[PDB]
Design an enzyme around this catalytic site. Structure first.
Site, mmCIF file in Angstrom:
data_model
loop_
_atom_site.group_PDB
_atom_site.id
_atom_site.type_symbol
_atom_site.label_atom_id
_atom_site.label_comp_id
_atom_site.label_asym_id
_atom_site.label_seq_id
_atom_site.Cartn_x
_atom_site.Cartn_y
_atom_site.Cartn_z
ATOM 1 N N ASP A 167 42.448 35.723 46.601
ATOM 2 C CA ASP A 167 41.382 36.774 46.707
ATOM 3 C C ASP A 167 40.070 36.319 47.340
ATOM 4 O O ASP A 167 39.193 35.711 46.694
ATOM 5 C CB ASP A 167 41.084 37.345 45.320
ATOM 6 C CG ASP A 167 40.176 38.546 45.388
ATOM 7 O OD1 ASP A 167 39.924 39.002 46.476
ATOM 8 O OD2 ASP A 167 39.674 38.992 44.338
ATOM 9 N N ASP A 219 38.554 41.486 52.006
ATOM 10 C CA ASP A 219 38.929 41.511 50.593
ATOM 11 C C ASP A 219 40.450 41.550 50.491
ATOM 12 O O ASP A 219 41.105 42.613 50.719
ATOM 13 C CB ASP A 219 38.290 42.673 49.811
ATOM 14 C CG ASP A 219 38.614 42.589 48.299
ATOM 15 O OD1 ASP A 219 38.514 43.616 47.570
ATOM 16 O OD2 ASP A 219 39.011 41.473 47.813
HETATM 17 C C1 LIG Z 1 35.520 42.453 46.274
HETATM 18 C C2 LIG Z 1 34.217 42.766 45.524
HETATM 19 C C3 LIG Z 1 33.005 43.160 46.391
HETATM 20 C C4 LIG Z 1 34.635 43.886 44.545
HETATM 21 C C5 LIG Z 1 33.500 44.140 43.581
HETATM 22 C C6 LIG Z 1 33.176 45.415 43.078
HETATM 23 C C7 LIG Z 1 32.056 45.543 42.231
HETATM 24 CL CL1 LIG Z 1 31.575 47.127 41.494
HETATM 25 C C8 LIG Z 1 31.298 44.420 41.873
HETATM 26 C C9 LIG Z 1 31.587 43.145 42.361
HETATM 27 C C10 LIG Z 1 32.662 42.989 43.227
HETATM 28 C C11 LIG Z 1 33.049 41.631 43.783
HETATM 29 N N1 LIG Z 1 32.652 40.544 43.106
HETATM 30 C C12 LIG Z 1 32.805 39.131 43.429
HETATM 31 C C13 LIG Z 1 31.443 38.542 43.862
HETATM 32 C C14 LIG Z 1 31.021 39.342 45.069
HETATM 33 C C15 LIG Z 1 30.068 40.381 45.028
HETATM 34 S S1 LIG Z 1 30.018 40.951 46.668
HETATM 35 C C16 LIG Z 1 31.149 39.977 47.517
HETATM 36 C C17 LIG Z 1 31.598 39.185 46.468
HETATM 37 BR BR1 LIG Z 1 32.975 37.857 47.033
HETATM 38 C C18 LIG Z 1 33.345 38.358 42.250
HETATM 39 O O1 LIG Z 1 33.530 38.954 41.185
HETATM 40 O O2 LIG Z 1 33.569 37.130 42.364
HETATM 41 N N2 LIG Z 1 33.805 41.584 44.789
#
Ligand SMILES: CC1(C)Cc2cc(Cl)ccc2C(N[C@@H](Cc2cscc2Br)C(=O)O)=N1
Ligand SMILES: [Zn+2]
Ligand SMILES: [Zn+2]
Ligand SMILES: [Zn+2]
Length: 393
Positions: A222, A36
């Site tokens: 990102d 990340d």
């Molecule tokens: C870095 C991370 C895991 C941070 C995050 C925190 C939370 Cl609470 C929900 C979704 C995310 C999230 N969402 C991504 C999609 C995703 C979910 S898990 C890995 C990924 Br890449 C996005 O919004 O595009 N990314």
């Protein structure tokens, strides 16, 4: 742990990011940790969760130390919280070293761990300024570089629910992972991996917006975001142009919103009607820029549906933002991305793992020279909160 030992050290599911194996504690506990670049905390699941079957067990680590302080991380659509500590950390398929690093043991979370993600934690590779609870909590990569002779650089090859592979090379660049030109854009500020977009084209047509709109209120690279995400004015311009090109198909609103698939008969998807998108990134030389070009294969992502084996079905992976441009997995998959912290810049080259169109290819090309144009950077209004906090460092 050569560069050949780090090639193919990433895995993931489609739209749920990429993870690397890390060992925490002694004796080692091996965990799958999401890479990340849009955050700065090392944090690992550390209590039972319905979607986890392994987690970090602090009690089984003799080298674990409690910092006796909690941290709480709210996201737009969920959160995690935990206890900070330090433990010994290595990357089995990365450099041959062990470091003592900060770890947040996640003790509670909401909508963070999803069904079949297969990662148990997050490796925040960005800079200290955005670490929680404050920038005094040293990020993992900063500890790696201070404790070892590992060069201050890492690179990601992310190859295009469906399995996905890739490579995180730590402390180097592997020429086997890309072909042709490696182009660098300045890191604008060391917080996120913040960069400057000077121009956007959709099939060669300039969006003609004030270039600051592109970077409103920042533009970041990102690997923890799936889509290309675009400030609202830019998102509207782009979708209007993309609709124009593909006008022989009339999709429902929900498609453009990323809420609905659209399908064609297996093997007949009319790719030529969807335009390429080129993002021109500020070059190291003050007048120059270079462009990254992505195929519609990158921004239209397949989901193999369930009442549809006869069909090829796709999701639109460009979505609206109120927090700037995010170049997520949609951009990075086409590319070998070098995070050159030592030289404060980000390189792009065409990836050796290629998701290519019959006629066209994803590209990295320059230079392009601009007599003038502008400062395309946006200056985020300074809050009294951010002004006051001392940074005695
Ligand atoms: C870095 C991370 C895991 C941070 C995050 C925190 C939370 Cl609470 C929900 C979704 C995310 C999230 N969402 C991504 C999609 C995703 C979910 S898990 C890995 C990924 Br890449 C996005 O919004 O595009 N990314
Ligand atoms: Zn392994
Ligand atoms: Zn002070
Ligand atoms: Zn500080």
């Amino acid at each position: 742990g050569s560069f050949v030992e780090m090639v193919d050290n990433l895995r993931g599911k489609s739209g749920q990011g990429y993870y690397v194996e890390m060992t925490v504690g002694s004796p080692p506990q091996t965990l799958n940790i999401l890479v990340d670049t849009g955050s700065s905390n090392f944090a690992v699941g550390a209590a039972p969760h319905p979607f986890l079957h392994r987690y970090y067990q602090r009690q089984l680590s003799s080298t674990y130390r409690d910092l006796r302080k909690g941290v709480y991380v709210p996201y737009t659509q969920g959160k995690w919280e935990g206890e900070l500590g330090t433990d010994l950390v290595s990357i089995p398929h990365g450099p041959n070293v062990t470091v003592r690093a900060n770890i947040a043991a996640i003790t509670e979370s909401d909508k963070f761990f999803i069904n079949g993600s297969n990662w148990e934690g997050i490796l925040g590779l960005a800079y200290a300024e955005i670490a929680r609870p404050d920038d005094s909590l040293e990020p993992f990569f900063d500890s790696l570089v201070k404790q070892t002779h590992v060069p201050n650089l890492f690179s990601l090859q992310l190859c295009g629910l469906a399995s996905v592979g890739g490579s995180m090379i730590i402390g180097g660049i592997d020429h086997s992972l890309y072909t042709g030109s490696l182009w660098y854009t300045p890191i604008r500020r060391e917080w996120y991996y913040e960069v400057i977009i000077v121009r956007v084209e959709i099939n060669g047509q300039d969006l003609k917006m004030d270039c600051k709109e592109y970077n409103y209120d920042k533009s970041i690279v990102d690997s923890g975001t799936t889509n290309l995400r675009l400030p609202k004015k830019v998102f509207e311009a782009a979708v209007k142009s993309i609709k124009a090109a593909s006008s022989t198909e009339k999709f429902p609103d929900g498609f453009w919103l990323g809420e609905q698939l659209v399908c064609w008969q297996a093997g007949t998807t009319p790719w030529n009607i969807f335009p390429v998108i080129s993002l021109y990134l500020m070059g190291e030389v003050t007048n120059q820029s270079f462009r990254i070009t992505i195929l519609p294969q990158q921004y239209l992502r397949p989901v193999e549906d369930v009442a549809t084996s006869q069909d090829d079905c796709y999701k639109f992976a460009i979505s609206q933002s109120s927090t700037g441009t995010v170049m997520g997995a949609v951009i990075m998959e086409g590319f070998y991305v070098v995070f050159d912290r030592a030289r404060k810049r980000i390189g792009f080259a065409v990836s050796a793992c290629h998701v290519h169109d019959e006629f066209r290819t994803a590209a990295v090309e320059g230079p392009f020279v601009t007599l003038d144009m502008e400062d395309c950077g946006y200056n985020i209004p300074q809050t009294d909160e951010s002004r006051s906090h001392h940074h005695h460092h």
